[PDB]
């Protein structure tokens, strides 16, 4: 393959192989589930440890009390993109005194990611993001891919084996979208979804983390004994 | 650095269901009453009016900035006519940012600005910014010469926020019109021709152009003879 050496090269079929390989980085990452109702949006993340002596790596990052994200893949790229998103939300608040819409944040990430696909010398981001937020248009969930594609979804999963959780979410959409009064039941729906991506592993207070955001629910991360209720 | 063509006072007032703002139509050139059709109330959507005093060239620059802001807000925003329309508070914060940055570059926009509007929650918005970036709110706001003469009259109607629910649009409009008349009596850079805008949380923006100061009293001047002793 002579065409995979850089982002600025199309293959004879119009593929961008470096972008595809950066997506393979995401596919190697551990599963994250996102799902939302009309009132609440939830992230569920399986963390991985390096070994029995290591901590579990953080999968979820707060942007704002109205917004936050979960990562799969190359965590330093998620740090870069999270700092950029924090700066954009901050700028919107400082200059307009308005909460940045989640859709506009997603497009700002799309545009930042696209530049690395178009010009020499950089590289694509190696990280997929699930962004949840609540704004004047209600609950939102976005999936970011470092091709620069951003899609608004009721639910999705990214990372390894995530198609099992995605299939479960597809099967149960018409239930969980209605869960508007009851954030804990939406969390339980997400935890049941991510269980479909587990292989030879179980959820524990160590490896599970959850976030939720919503109408009167500032973005909050539950981890440790705070998730024992949902296991 | 030095204002050349200038607008004079903008005056404004909260009332029970909205805000009223008025400005005369004159561009003066020093003492020369040079330009007589200068509109100084800039509507921004259906919920906001920006009243500008001071340098007319900087006013025209601000009006351009506001049209651009509406265009940019519509980009990739299918709710730009709805819950993601510009609010008065967004427009004010943007203008105040620009004004203070310009001041800090020692290159002021030589203007005093009142942003009048109704928030989507129905709250009255009424806030002032000047060329220094100094901002304040009050139930009545007036720029320039109107600060010295119109504010006393409007405050006789709305002296405190608990007077706002007692104050009808009829009373407020009558007070604004009388204050414009007083300014025509006493401001040498005023015009009898003015524009008035009403922003009502129910009846929306009503923008009244080509109003004229009427019912002036001059007949007592017949009795004035000399300056002391001339019979």
UniProtKB/Swiss-Prot annotation, chain A:
Transmembrane segments: none annotated. There is a cross-link at residue 188 (Glycyl lysine isopeptide (Lys-Gly) (interchain with G-Cter in ubiquitin)). The keyword Cell membrane does not apply. It is found in: Cytoplasm; Nucleus. Its main location: cytoplasm. Coiled coil: none annotated. PROSITE patterns: PROTEASOME_ALPHA_1, PROTEASOME_ALPHA_2. Keywords: Cytoplasm, Isopeptide bond, Nucleus, Phosphoprotein, Proteasome, Ubl conjugation. GO terms for biological process: proteasomal ubiquitin-independent protein catabolic process; proteasome-mediated ubiquitin-dependent protein catabolic process. One of its GO terms (cellular component) is proteasome complex. Pfam families: Proteasome (PF00227), Proteasome_A_N (PF10584). Present with 7210 molecules/cell in log phase SD medium. Belongs to the peptidase T1A family. The proteasome degrades poly-ubiquitinated proteins in the cytoplasm and in the nucleus. It is essential for the regulated turnover of proteins and for the removal of misfolded proteins. The proteasome is a multicatalytic proteinase complex that is characterized by its ability to cleave peptides with Arg, Phe, Tyr, Leu, and Glu adjacent to the leaving group at neutral or slightly basic pH. It has an ATP-dependent proteolytic activity. The 26S proteasome consists of a 20S proteasome core and two 19S regulatory subunits. The 20S proteasome core is composed of 28 subunits that are arranged in four stacked rings, resulting in a barrel-shaped structure. The two end rings are each formed by seven alpha subunits, and the two central rings are each formed by seven beta subunits. The catalytic chamber with the active sites is on the inside of the barrel. This is Proteasome subunit alpha type-6. It comes from Saccharomyces cerevisiae (strain ATCC 204508 / S288c).
UniProtKB/Swiss-Prot annotation, chain B:
GO terms for cellular component: cytosol; nucleus; proteasome complex; proteasome core complex, beta-subunit complex; proteasome storage granule. GO terms for biological process: proteasomal ubiquitin-independent protein catabolic process; proteasome assembly; proteasome-mediated ubiquitin-dependent protein catabolic process. It holds the Pfam family Proteasome. Keywords: Cytoplasm, Nucleus, Proteasome. It comes from the Eukaryota. Its main location: cytoplasm. InterPro entries: Ntn_hydrolases_N (IPR029055), Proteasome_beta4 (IPR016295), Proteasome_bsu_CS (IPR016050), Proteasome_sua/b (IPR001353), Proteasome_suB-type (IPR023333). It is found in: Cytoplasm; Nucleus. The 26S proteasome consists of a 20S proteasome core and two 19S regulatory subunits. The 20S proteasome core is composed of 28 subunits that are arranged in four stacked rings, resulting in a barrel-shaped structure. The two end rings are each formed by seven alpha subunits, and the two central rings are each formed by seven beta subunits. The catalytic chamber with the active sites is on the inside of the barrel. Interacts with CIC1. Non-catalytic component of the proteasome which degrades poly-ubiquitinated proteins in the cytoplasm and in the nucleus. It is essential for the regulated turnover of proteins and for the removal of misfolded proteins. The proteasome is a multicatalytic proteinase complex that is characterized by its ability to cleave peptides with Arg, Phe, Tyr, Leu, and Glu adjacent to the leaving group at neutral or slightly basic pH. It has an ATP-dependent proteolytic activity. PRE3 and PRE4 are necessary for the peptidyl-glutamyl-peptide-hydrolyzing activity. Belongs to the peptidase T1B family. Present with 16900 molecules/cell in log phase SD medium. This is Proteasome subunit beta type-7.
